Design a binder for this molecule. Structure first.
Ligand SMILES: [Mg+2]
Ligand SMILES: [Zn+2]
Ligand SMILES: [Zn+2]
Ligand SMILES: [Zn+2]
Lengths: 15, 65, 770, 98, 49, 136, 262, 43, 166, 83, 112, 196
């Protein structure tokens, strides 16, 4: 229900 | 364009919290809904102020004087 | 056009307006900063010289001051740049240009200003910061709101234009718009919402809050009404406290369907002597309604009382409502689970009914009813089902809302919103449409590139199914935006074409005027009509009343009016009146009754010629029912008690009265026949109301009551005659252009443009054969 | 069953001004046209360097705030770096008649 | 943040509004409902670029 | 200053139509077989069920009206000290329904009350403002 | 005695008390007074010797006004319209000053702790910028890049919130009575069940539940208000409640006084 | 500012209305009111 | 169509009937075609009614058409306002449009006519025709800045003499 | 011209425009220190004095009512009826 | 030019009293007092006190326009008891309730 | 104006202790009457309030993008978790008397923008300022102390009222009267008056 601008954590700590 | 002193609705002093908040967000990797509750901003009137402030003054300071 | 017919002017101001629930109906709040500027040149007389001397000492700056002194010799002096002179000696006949001050009348105006209520005269009240503040009721005539509208102020510069304002264009005098002979100002917004809540049957008020409520009514005598409840805990009812603000001697009763003197659902109204007896006060009673409380109070008590009635209602209801609070939010727009299911079903059936018609049409099994090809027949059916579905779904939502539901409470108070609104928010948004047709095939054979070709399903041609609560899917959004744009363009067009019409109308009927013989002539003097409006009556004094002879079965007509003494088929029981005993079988009188009853039969015959569809309620001058009551209550009509009236007094009384209702009062033959006619229909009314059977059996008026009823009807009637000098041409044009702004054959504005521009070839030359 | 394309995001049919309405699909259509024309006369920060321009008539809000309810598209319009309003705390009430 | 896209004429900032027109070199066909002797027309606003 | 009417009724039924604090009461007189009653009651202040008997009274006054009511002072011998409910109403219709059946209507600040019976008993309440007392 | 007080918390800057055996109009009137009418010190006039920061003067001057100054001993000051000084003196005001210069290459922050009093306090305990934080920097006032300078002189005065929200010693004041809805002072909106949709208050536990199935006590009034007061920090909380009472007493007393002038 | 640089104009069939073909190429919501309604478009 | 008609008991009762609507108009021809009721036949083209039934019917039809336009959308205007307009349009015999051609071509004083539509060409004709414009219209008086004989201006105030005995 | 007093045919009442114009001029005159035919019981507003005289029928004016042809009747405010 | 000076806004405007008193001719033995530079803070407090008194027949106040800080109060006592004196006791009892509160609170504060 | 086509002007400003307050001691920054809602049918304004109240509590950012799957029931439930009534209502207390309001108030944050139209740029008055040259009527424009227009339609409205004198004064005294002499024979303004 929100906008999650911390996805640049996973996409930084997945790749 | 910088860190309001007291919360509009509430009067609570909030302008001594921006750096403590940014740092909380940045070095301890809290989320805001937890950073804020740690600074004691409980009423959502006060949470609005910090959570939503836009620190434009940094961009002004770039213009060399 | 731009320099003679209209021009810019001095002594005016313009600023943003705001509301104020604490100014009287006729005040306007003027910013002190503006009042310091506008100015009014007063003449020094013995009665004000010292007071004016004071102002000149205050000088230009402090507020109640002045800016120039004008010496009788036509010479003027700036008060600043005269402190050097310092003290100044006034003399009689000098003029001081003071600031404007409280209670000065000014003319207030809101543009476009397309009818005479868009310029009324208010009284100044000087207030702080820079908006004009006006009462809320006055807002609907000006057609203003407070989203930045500005209004203009004009200050009258003379002692005589002042009196023109106060006595002709003042606000209280325009309470009854002459355009549709009903009020133009009513209780409308919050106050209308609060006043419904205050008057519900189970709103009770306690002592402390009662006292504050009373003390707000600025004319309250100082008597605490006995609580409708004592022991335990004295409690006042909402109706009680509201009834304090109504002036005494008002009587009103409406009967909505289901109403009974026991008013189960609590509808209708029954005010008796300025006390509410039952009935929830809502739009029908206190809004800008036709026979409602505002209408009555104005007629019966006069504009100035009726203007206090406004501010007294508001001051009370606004105060209660502030301490009761009222709000709205999404939860108001939400129908429960069971309901949403039926709406979903009800919608789904429509798709079936539409599908079927599609198959029947595609099997070529249809029947294009003569007068439309198979296509059109197919469309109408679809749009029919799709529109019945939305409405069917609306009723499903409205029903399930409980009296809590705040938007239901604003529909019920008539205050804001309506059924369509709640249907679209909660149930479904229904069929978008562009030019009366569903969404066309802009792409080749499909409405959007998201559909395959030849797709006539409701959702393909533009049937928005969700509700504003659920949200619109991207296609619906776009179809809705397509329908919505068409609304904007019309509005743009409908106001440009309205504006041109209304200005042609005014220039055509610009100079017609009611002359001092009741003709209606233009500037040259040509007769336009021989009495104004064919009866000489003023529009503002007309009311819908019912002719009681036109209708009904003749048996009922017999029963109601027939009276025969000598025989007992329709006899009159004596105990109605004192002399009824010795009346029985008289003959001198038994003559009259027939002659009377003869007349009525002629009327019933006559009216059915005038109103060929038996229509019975027609606008007429003096309201007679209301004159009956006031008599009944003023004289405390003891029913169960015989009457002093004697048949002769009644029948002669009516028959005499007619000779006095003078619209025209020349003395030759021609005039005496115009007068014959001007009062024909009115006399028919007056005869039906005042037939003896009614007077004795129903109203039971005393001798004393009757002549009071008679002498009023004469007094009121004479006051309804139009006043020579009245510019009824402009009044007539502005009354047509005004509705012309509130908007298979062509209708509405384009039809109107056809009529006035009397056009050789209209769009739809139809023809109706019987 | 024969799709030959898919939309990237259906919300991209909106222009710039309307990309700032939140939940524009829950509104009546003209209401979106209004706001889309008012928002152009809101008052925010128009450029980060207003202190060195010499325009006629500039207006700057003292304390802009980004909206609490945002739109994905507002990311590309920088609307959260130069926002043009404040998150008032609103009550919907008939409080005093004013 | 300034995104360019304008001109500076006399110290003033100017936009060129996109102007819209019909396409050239396209055959269009029109009924003429008017009692005119011509009941259809096929236009082509030809143009070389 | 005295009772204008009196009787004991038994509540046939009770309806809270759409309201939360008031109910419309259905009563019949125990003694007379034709003295009906209908009444709205602030049941939040005086709960009533079906088949609870009740005494009614009219009492043109309460001593033992055009006057500013004043809060009850101190051990005052007002009437109604022997009732639980008290309303002060205004007659507004005397409606001779049939032969000596007659119905009269009161409005207690908006709570309505229809009362009817033989012209005998009712003959004495007439268009005034009247009190109204109930107990048990 | 009359009204009773009972405390449930006392933080550095909150007090949570139960106010009992009083009536609503006194509780509420009390609450209105702490919000509005307790005197306090706050910068009120700013003269800017130089300012080359990226903020406008009235912008900065407005932030200085909201900086909460120590005003525990504020009665020993006077309303600047009661001194006879040529507009201000140590008997009616406090003077501070602020010099800042951007020196490091990094940004340099100006804080409220950089205000320095330059007038004789005459021993009164007023005027210091309240520092509630743990790093001891107060309210951030401005930021400076190297080469930018700010010099200004502030004058703090005595005033009340009713005149500008800066002279206000209290932040949000909670207030609540009758948490079960026994008095029926509010009617709950609901869709299916009110009791489910409206969460219980915290206080709902200091009073026993309404004891379902009993008459509506129509002659119970409202007492036992659960108030909680949060102080901005210019004066310690206890003083907010106590000086709130005094100010209310001085107001009522004033009416009493002016009566005797008949 | 942005919305200015993305704005089109139409010198004066049924041109003010929203055509299906505008889907996704001009904004449905945004157009001025009055004499320019629909004649001024935004991408 | 339903059609309220009286009953043999004498009260009105709805009562249906067939009614041929029609596209296009030819009033006189159709008026004779037997089987119809040639009295109660109508048309929304009131120009033709004026030609076939003469002006007075043309006026009543005109009122009918205006009243439909107004009332169609639910509004309600008092009768006299509509009748007054419809009378202006038909006091010369024959319909006069509310346009430059219709009323501005009467002889109502150039300073009034010139102020509506085609100001100069009107003023020229007047000057050629040596029109004498007598200044009784409100519009003429406005230009001269005089008190128009309107409302409060529609009479004079004379100073009584005998009553000045006291 | 000059319809004779016994043949006056127009209304015996005061039109609201007559009432407004009368009170205007009367007030205007008073505001020019014209004599006053009534006891100004404390009143000082010329319009309110005028409303007082008119209620006592002490205004010495007279209404010349023009007919459409050009002739006219004359009524003296003292004899016209006010509502 | 619109609004006034501000220390007077609490310091009663000099020249004119903090209270004006008029008799209410409408009813017997009443009064209507006009406090200046006041508002609901004192109004509601004082009024609500009076209603405790058993000899007051009517207490109420209003604030006729939020723009201006002034409120009116109307008292009507039973005969033989001067309104001006019911106001004294109200004002008097209020000070004692407050005095107690202040002391009853400091006490509790000193147990923390 | 909010972001949904509700403009408004400030009606009046109360101080914080006059506003209604909730139990947590929160007062609105802004009150907007309920009658704005039902007929604008602007539901997005209500959802956005609901969404932002949650966002502020939870410290997130609310996704209000148009065609998503975020629903009111979703937002409703979250709110209830943070301990508030699930549709945004709140018990509030009257500011004047501290009494509970009998209705409950929908209440939470909402993005509002401040439009360009300040009142001080619009208030305007004039008594006897300067006049145009060609025509010698008052000049136009607030900026140059202009005069407001008494238009054609205002003239008509005054006629309908019958106020003939005001119509005259407003057209000659208040704008540009001018005495001129005319020959009694050729009615032409050609008299050479040496009125000295
Ligand atoms: Mg508007
Ligand atoms: Zn806060
Ligand atoms: Zn000093
Ligand atoms: Zn000559």
């Amino acid at each position: 229900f929100i906008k999650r601008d911390r996805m640049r954590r996973n996409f930084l700590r997945m790749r | 364009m910088i860190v309001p002193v007291r919360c509009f609705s509430c009067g609570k002093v909030v302008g001594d919290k921006w750096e403590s908040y940014l740092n909380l967000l940045q070095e301890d990797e809290l989320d805001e809904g937890t950073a804020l509750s740690r600074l004691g901003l409980k009423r959502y009137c006060c949470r609005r102020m910090i959570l939503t402030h836009v620190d434009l003054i940094e961009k002004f300071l770039r213009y060399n004087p | 056009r731009g320099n003679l017919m209209g021009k810019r002017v001095d002594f005016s101001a313009r600023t943003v307006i705001s509301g104020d629930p604490n100014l009287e109906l006729d005040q306007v709040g003027v910013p002190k900063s503006i009042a310091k500027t506008l100015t009014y040149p007063e003449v020094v007389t013995p009665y004000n010289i010292d007071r004016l001397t004071q102002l000149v000492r205050n000088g230009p700056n402090e507020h109640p001051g002045a800016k120039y002194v004008i010496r009788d010799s036509g010479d003027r002096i700036d008060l600043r740049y005269s402190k050097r002179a310092g003290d100044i000696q006034l003399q009689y006949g000098w003029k001081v240009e003071r600031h404007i001050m409280d209670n000065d009348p000014v003319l207030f105006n809101r543009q476009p200003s397309l009818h005479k209520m868009s310029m009324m005269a208010h009284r100044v009240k000087v207030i702080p910061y820079s908006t004009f503040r006006l009462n809320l009721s006055v807002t609907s005539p000006y057609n203003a709101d407070f989203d930045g509208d500005e209004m203009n102020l004009h200050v009258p510069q003379s002692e005589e234009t002042r009196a023109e304002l106060s006595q002709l264009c003042a606000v209280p005098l325009q309470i009854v718009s002459p355009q549709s002979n009903k009020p133009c100002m009513g209780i409308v917004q919050d106050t209308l919402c609060g006043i419904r809540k205050l008057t519900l049957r189970d709103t009770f008020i306690e002592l402390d809050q009662v006292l504050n409520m009373l003390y707000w009514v600025p004319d309250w005598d100082g008597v605490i009404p006995t609580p409708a409840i004592i022991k335990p805990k004295p409690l006042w009812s909402g109706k009680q406290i509201l009834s304090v603000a109504i002036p005494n001697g008002i009587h009103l009763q409406r009967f909505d369907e289901g109403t009974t003197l026991l008013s189960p659902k609590d509808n209708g109204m029954l005010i008796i002597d300025g006390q509410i007896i039952f009935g929830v006060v809502e739009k029908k009673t206190v809004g800008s309604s036709n026979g409602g409380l505002i209408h009555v109070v104005t007629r019966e008590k006069g504009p100035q009382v009726c203007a206090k009635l406004f501010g007294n209602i508001q001051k009370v209801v606004n105060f209660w409502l502030l301490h009761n609070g009222f709000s709205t939010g999404i939860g108001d727009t939400i129908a429960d689970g069971p309901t949403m299911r039926e709406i979903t079903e009800t919608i789904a059936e429509a798709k079936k009914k539409v599908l079927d018609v599609t198959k029947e049409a595609q099997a070529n099994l249809l029947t294009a009813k003569h007068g439309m090809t198979l296509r059109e027949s197919f469309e109408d059916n679809v749009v029919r089902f799709l529109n019945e579905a939305r409405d069917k779904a609306g009723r499903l939502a409205e029903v399930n809302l409980k009296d809590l539901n705040n938007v239901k409470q604003m529909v019920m108070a008539g205050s804001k919103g309506s059924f369509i609104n709640i249907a679209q928010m909660s149930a479904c948004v229904g069929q978008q449409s562009v030019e009366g047709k569903r969404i066309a095939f802009g792409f080749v054979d499909r409405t959007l590139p998201h559909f395959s070709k030849d797709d006539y399903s409701p959702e393909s041609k533009g049937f928005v199914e969700n509700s504003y609560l659920r949200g619109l899917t991207p296609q619906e959004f776009f179809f809705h935006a397509m329908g919505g744009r068409e609304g904007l363009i019309d509005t743009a067009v409908k106001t440009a074409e309205t504006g041109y019409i209304q200005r042609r109308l005014v220039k055509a009927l610009e100079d017609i005027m009611v002359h001092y013989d009741n003709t209606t002539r233009n500037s040259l003097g040509n007769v336009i009509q021989f009495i104004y409006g064919e009866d000489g009556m003023d529009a503002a004094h007309i009311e819908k009343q019912s002719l009681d002879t036109i209708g009904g079965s003749d048996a009922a007509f017999e029963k109601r009016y027939r009276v025969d003494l000598l025989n007992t088929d329709h006899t009159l029981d004596p105990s109605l009146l004192e002399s009824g005993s010795e009346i029985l079988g008289d003959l001198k009188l038994q003559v009259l009754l027939d002659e009377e009853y003869k007349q009525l039969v002629k009327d019933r015959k006559f009216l059915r010629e005038v109103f060929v569809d038996g229509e019975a309620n027609w606008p007429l001058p003096v309201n007679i029912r209301r004159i009956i009551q006031n008599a009944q209550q003023t004289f405390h009509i003891d029913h169960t008690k015989p009457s002093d009236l004697t048949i002769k007094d009644i029948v002669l009384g009516v028959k005499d009265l007619q000779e006095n209702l003078l619209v025209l009062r020349g003395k030759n033959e021609i005039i005496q026949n115009a007068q014959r006619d001007a009062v024909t229909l009115f006399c028919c009314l007056l005869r039906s109301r005042l037939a003896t059977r009614r007077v004795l059996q129903e109203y039971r008026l005393t001798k004393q009551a009757f002549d009071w009823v008679l002498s009023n009807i004469e007094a009121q009637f004479l006051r309804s005659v139009v006043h020579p000098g009245e510019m009824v041409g402009v009044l007539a044009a502005q009354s047509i252009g005004e509705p012309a702004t509130q908007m298979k054959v062509t209708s509405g504005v384009p039809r109107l443009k056809e009529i006035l521009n009397v056009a050789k070839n209209m769009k739809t030359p139809s023809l109706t054969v019987y | 069953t024969t799709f030959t394309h898919c939309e990237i995001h259906p919300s991209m049919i909106l222009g710039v001004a309307a990309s700032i309405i939140p939940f524009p699909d829950h509104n009546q259509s003209p209401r979106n046209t209004y706001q889309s024309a008012m928002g152009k006369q809101a008052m925010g920060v128009f450029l980060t360097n207003y202190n060195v321009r010499m325009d006629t008539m500039a207006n700057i809000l003292y304390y802009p705030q980004k909206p609490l309810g945002t739109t994905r598209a507002m990311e590309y319009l920088k609307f959260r770096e130069l926002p043009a309003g404040q998150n008032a705390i609103v009550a919907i009430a008939c409080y005093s008649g004013y | 943040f300034d995104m360019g896209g304008y001109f500076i004429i006399n110290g003033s900032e100017k936009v060129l509004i996109a102007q819209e027109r019909s396409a050239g070199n396209i055959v269009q066909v029109f009924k003429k409902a008017a009692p005119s002797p011509i009941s259809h027309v096929a236009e082509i606003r030809s143009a070389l670029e | 200053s005295n009772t204008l009417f009196d009787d004991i009724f038994q509540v046939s039924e009770v309806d809270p139509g759409r309201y939360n604090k008031v109910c419309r009461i259905e009563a019949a007189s125990t003694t007379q077989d034709q003295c009906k009653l209908t009444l709205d009651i602030n049941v939040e202040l005086f709960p009533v069920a079906a088949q609870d008997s009740l005494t009614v009274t009219i009492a043109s006054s309460l001593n033992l009206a055009t006057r500013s009511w004043r809060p009850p002072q101190a051990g005052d011998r007002s009437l109604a000290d022997d009732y639980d409910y008290v309303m002060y109403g205004t007659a507004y219709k005397f409606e001779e329904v049939s032969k000596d059946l007659i119905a009269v209507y009161y409005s207690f600040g908006g709570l309505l009350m229809r009362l009817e019976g033989n012209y005998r008993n009712l003959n004495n309440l007439k268009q005034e403002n009247a009190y109204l007392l109930i107990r048990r | 005695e009359g009204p009773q007080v009972k405390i449930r918390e006392a933080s550095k800057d909150n007090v949570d008390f139960i106010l009992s055996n009083v009536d609503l109009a006194m509780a509420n009137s009390l609450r209105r007074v702490m919000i509005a009418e307790i005197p306090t010190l706050a910068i009120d006039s700013v003269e800017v010797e130089t300012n080359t920061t990226v903020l406008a003067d009235e912008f900065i001057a407005h932030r200085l006004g909201l900086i909460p100054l120590q005003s525990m001993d504020i009665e020993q000051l006077e309303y600047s319209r009661d001194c006879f000084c040529e507009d201000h003196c140590d008997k009616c005001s406090v003077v501070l000053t602020l010099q800042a210069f951007g020196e490091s290459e990094s940004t340099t922050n100006v804080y409220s702790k950089d205000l320095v009093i330059v007038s004789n306090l005459m021993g009164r305990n007023i005027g210091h910028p309240i520092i509630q934080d743990k790093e001891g920097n107060g309210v951030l006032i401005c930021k400076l890049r190297k080469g930018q300078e700010l010099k200004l002189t502030c004058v703090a005065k005595k005033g009340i919130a009713k005149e500008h929200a800066k002279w206000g010693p209290a932040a949000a004041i909670e207030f609540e009575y009758d948490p079960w809805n026994k008095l029926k002072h509010t009617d709950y909106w609901y869709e299916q069940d009110s009791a489910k949709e409206w969460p219980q208050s915290k206080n709902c536990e200091y009073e026993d539940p309404p004891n379902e199935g009993d008459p509506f006590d129509y002659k119970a009034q409202a007492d036992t208000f659960y108030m909680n007061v949060e102080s901005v920090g210019s004066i310690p909380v206890d003083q907010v409640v106590v000086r709130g009472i005094d100010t209310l007493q001085k107001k009522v007393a004033s009416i009493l006084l002016a009566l005797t002038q008949m | 500012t942005l919305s200015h640089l993305r704005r089109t104009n139409t010198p004066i069939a049924k041109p003010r209305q929203l055509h299906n073909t505008h889907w996704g190429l001009v904004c449905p919501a945004e157009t001025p009111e009055g004499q320019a309604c629909g004649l001024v478009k935004n991408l | 169509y339903d059609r309220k008609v009286p009953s043999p008991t004498g009260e009105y009762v709805k009562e249906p009937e067939w009614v041929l609507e029609t596209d296009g108009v030819n009033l006189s021809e159709v008026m004779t075609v037997p089987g119809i009721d040639p009295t109660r036949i109508y048309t929304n083209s009131f120009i033709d009614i004026m030609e076939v039934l003469g002006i007075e019917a043309g006026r009543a039809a005109l009122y009918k058409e205006v009243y439909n336009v107004i009332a169609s959308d639910g509004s309600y205007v008092n009768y006299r306002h509509m009748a007054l307009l419809v009378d202006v349009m038909t006091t010369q015999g024959g319909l006069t449009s509310v346009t430059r051609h219709g009323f501005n071509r009467s002889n109502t004083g150039a300073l009034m006519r010139c102020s509506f539509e085609e100001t100069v060409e009107i003023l020229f004709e007047a000057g050629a025709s040596a029109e004498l414009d007598d200044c009784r219209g409100v519009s003429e008086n406005v230009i001269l800045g005089q008190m128009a004989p309107i409302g409060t201006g529609a009479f004079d105030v004379m100073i009584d003499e005998e009553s000045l005995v006291k | 011209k000059a319809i004779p007093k016994d043949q006056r045919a127009t209304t015996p009442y005061m039109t609201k425009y007559e009432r407004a114009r009368i009170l205007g001029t009367r007030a205007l005159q008073i505001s020019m220190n014209a004599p006053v035919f009534v006891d100004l019981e404390g009143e000082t507003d010329p319009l309110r004095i005028a409303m007082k005289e008119l209620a006592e029928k002490k205004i010495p004016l007279v209404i010349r009512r023009y007919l459409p042809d050009g002739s006219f009747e004359d009524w003296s405010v003292e004899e016209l009826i006010v509502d | 030019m619109n609004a006034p000076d501000r220390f007077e806004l609490f310091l009663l405007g000099e020249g004119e009293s903090k209270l004006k008193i008029d008799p209410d001719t409408k009813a017997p033995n009443a009064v209507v007092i006009t406090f200046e530079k006041e508002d609901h803070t004192l109004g509601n407090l004082i009024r609500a006190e009076l209603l405790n008194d058993r000899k007051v027949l009517f207490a109420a106040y209003k604030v006729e326009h939020p723009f201006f800080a002034r409120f009116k109060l109307r008292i009507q006592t039973t005969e033989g008891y001067d309104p001006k004196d019911a106001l004294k006791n109200a004002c008097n009892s209020i000070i004692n309730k407050l005095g107690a509160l202040k002391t009853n609170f400091e006490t509790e504060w000193n147990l923390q | 104006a909010s972001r949904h086509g509700q403009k408004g002007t400030i009606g009046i400003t109360y101080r914080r202790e006059d506003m209604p307050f909730t139990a947590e001691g929160i007062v609105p920054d802004l009150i907007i009457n309920p009658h704005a809602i039902p007929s604008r049918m602007t539901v997005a304004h209500l959802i956005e309030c609901l969404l932002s109240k949650v966002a502020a509590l939870s410290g997130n950012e609310g996704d209000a993008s148009p065609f998503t799957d975020i629903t009111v029931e979703g937002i409703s439930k979250l709110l209830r978790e943070h301990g508030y009534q699930s549709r945004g209502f709140e018990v509030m207390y009257n500011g004047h008397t501290g009494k509970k309001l009998m209705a409950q108030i929908f209440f939470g944050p909402t993005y509002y923008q401040r439009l360009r139209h300040m009142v001080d740029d619009k208030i305007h008055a004039r008594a006897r300022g300067p006049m145009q040259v060609l025509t010698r009527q008052p000049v136009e424009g607030r900026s140059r102390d202009g005069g407001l227009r008494f238009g054609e339609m205002e003239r008509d409205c005054m006629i309908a009222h019958g106020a003939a004198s005001f119509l005259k004064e407003r057209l000659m005294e208040a704008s540009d009267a001018f005495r001129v002499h005319i020959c009694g024979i050729c009615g032409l303004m050609t008299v050479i008056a040496k009125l000295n």
